[PDB]
Symmetry: C2
Subunit: 383 residues, 2 copies
């Protein structure tokens, strides 16, 4: 019958899952689709390490053995990395091989360049990406907002629910394995920013760079912020956001007050969600694909290839003399025209304000009038 | 160079009219890009004489379905007519005549879908319908019912008042039975159970209660206990058997479903070795359904010249209890006495909380029972007003 010769680049949990899925379905893929899938090579970085299962496949540490094997039809890449992984896939596509990748490090620049190279060479490129269980697989979309990093969200949920400091919540997350020992990628919003890049590419068909994402992490969020927001009617989340207005994507990741009635406000712990605006709003909620589900998507893609607004702001000001009423009147005098304002006690000689309907952050303005602005967080879900 | 894709439409309501307009405004791009020319050769309608827009008048309308079913030039039949009889037999005939079928028929249940999918596969043609290891799903599957419960909750009105308001705003139809009695949601549970579990159940197998008995008191007492009330359509697949229901259900306020308000719908999915997932959004209008039909049409257009479920083995490293909200009335004595009696009579369970409901009326939320304590409470001399299931947890 028709042999489909494939190679895997990488064999972590995802690659091991792909293998097992192919194994336990080989007979039905054979019997039904008249295709015999042969895993001819598996590239691993270290043949002598352990996994995952001593097995029957040809393992190699030499990628050229795979890229120069002209009998191969499809390369499945689950290795990760940009260099030299991306060049490997460029070579594969140039050699007229279909590519299916679940590479988590790929950004939009990479995806576009591979998609183009694929089309140019008359072969498929299937990208398997998850941000919120499972995979997008999402109009015209004008805006998305997401909670895109489990660890950061877990930390904010723990602070909120158990009334602990960031430092205490981060240690707890480390203890439970949610946070790594160096948790920077999670708590500084970098992981979420990568997902904003990919989601902006799939939603808007625009390539932005990782450093075009205006990014602030959660390490400066305090219990005071959480409790003041709470009394104002908001939760605090690390929100990854993209807005596509007038040919331009504005993308960000930062601590954001979210109205408690918004679906995103309810997304707690290590759960993720992507909320899409265009038609009514839509949302996908979940932890975001496990190895087994990602593996499943890969094999399905394998079988398919075989077949063929104003802005709102929360502003914290300190060293304020005088009463909250006086502060409120002063803000009313200095702000440009806006829809609404509320003020709250924050700390000793410190007030917070939620301001609805500005074109940009009033931080510099409030600063230029002689106030000490601690920080400003955007406010979402308003009405 | 181009090849004509000859289609026929069965029915021309809002959905069929949308399909036509969508095909019209995309004909040139479908032509120019996919090298296929879609020709709507026949449209079946009930009444060929009724006034119609200028655009419709240029298509060949017929009242005779055999004209369509005996036209061997047709590649695809698009059914948007509704009905089971005779519509289902029409589609059986089409499939047997080697025609692809795309249906947005809202009256189709799992029995019909399976019989058509099989017949399609048997005849080597596509069947597309618009209308994992999953073990359970729970959904808010009817916009109108959910809107009513949200309005009762947020605005503190009676069911009757909230239903009238929903009628005024066009959410509820003038005869809203299908919505408020949970029939629509029950149909969706049937379909969702078929797609989630690959099991056919009948509509009559869905234990169904509507929302017309939910009161503001239920809502406010649930609220004080930490719950919202929703109309939940639910399917649980345990030991080869699907247990399916639609009914008013208390949902812990911290559960993602609890936040789904007004006309929005959601399907919350639970699976054996995976996190929970949920999809949230409004029910499709005619335009979106029309859009789905055309996209399915274009996908089938690439059938030009199979079916599997991938099975998973995890080397990748007790029946669930039930929870209940019980309202009892004509109760003499104190809430403490009621609580103590329940503690004495209930079989083993994980927790019990009681609340005032009305004059000589109490409610209890009981977590972790094997089965409804209704008969048991009844046999101990309590008048049970009603019992709702309770979801979300720990």
């Amino acid at each position: 019958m028709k042999k489909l010769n494939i190679a895997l680049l990488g064999l972590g949990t995802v690659g091991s899952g792909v293998v097992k899925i192919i194994e336990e379905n080989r007979q039905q893929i054979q019997d039904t689709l008249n295709k015999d899938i042969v895993i001819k090579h598996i590239l691993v970085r270290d043949k002598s390490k352990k996994r995952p299962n001593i097995s029957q496949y040809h393992l190699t540490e030499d990628v050229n053995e795979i890229l120069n094997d002209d009998s191969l039809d499809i390369i499945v890449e689950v290795m990760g990395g940009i260099e030299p992984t991306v060049d490997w896939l460029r070579t594969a596509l140039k050699n007229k091989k279909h590519v299916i990748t679940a590479n988590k490090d790929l950004l939009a620049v990479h995806l576009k360049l591979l998609e183009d190279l694929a089309e140019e060479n008359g072969v498929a490129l299937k990208f398997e990406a998850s941000v919120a269980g499972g995979i997008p697989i999402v109009n015209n979309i004008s805006k998305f907002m997401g909670i895109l990093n489990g660890t950061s969200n877990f930390i904010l949920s723990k602070m909120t629910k158990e009334q602990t400091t960031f430092e205490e919540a981060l240690d707890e997350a480390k203890r439970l394995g949610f946070a790594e020992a160096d948790p920077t990628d999670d708590v500084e919003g970098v992981d979420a920013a990568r997902k904003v890049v990919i989601t902006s590419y799939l939603s808007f068909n625009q390539v932005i760079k990782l450093n075009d994402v205006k990014r602030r992490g959660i390490s400066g969020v305090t219990l005071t912020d959480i409790n003041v927001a709470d009394q104002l009617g908001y939760k605090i989340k690390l929100i990854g956001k993209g807005i596509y207005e007038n040919g331009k994507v504005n993308a960000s990741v930062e601590p954001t007050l979210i109205d408690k009635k918004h679906q995103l406000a309810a997304v707690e712990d290590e759960y993720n969600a992507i909320y899409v605006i265009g038609v009514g709003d839509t949302m996908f909620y979940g932890k975001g694909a496990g190895s087994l589900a990602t593996g499943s998507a890969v094999v399905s893609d394998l079988l398919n290839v075989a077949l063929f607004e104003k802005s709102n702001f929360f502003v914290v000001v300190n060293h304020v003399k005088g009463s909250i009423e006086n502060f409120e009147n002063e803000l009313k005098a200095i702000l440009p025209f806006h829809r609404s304002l509320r003020v709250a006690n924050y700390d000793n000689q410190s007030y917070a304000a939620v301001i609805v309907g500005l074109e940009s952050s009033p931080e510099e303005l409030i600063t230029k009038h002689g106030y000490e602005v601690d920080k400003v967080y955007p406010v979402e879900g308003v009405l």
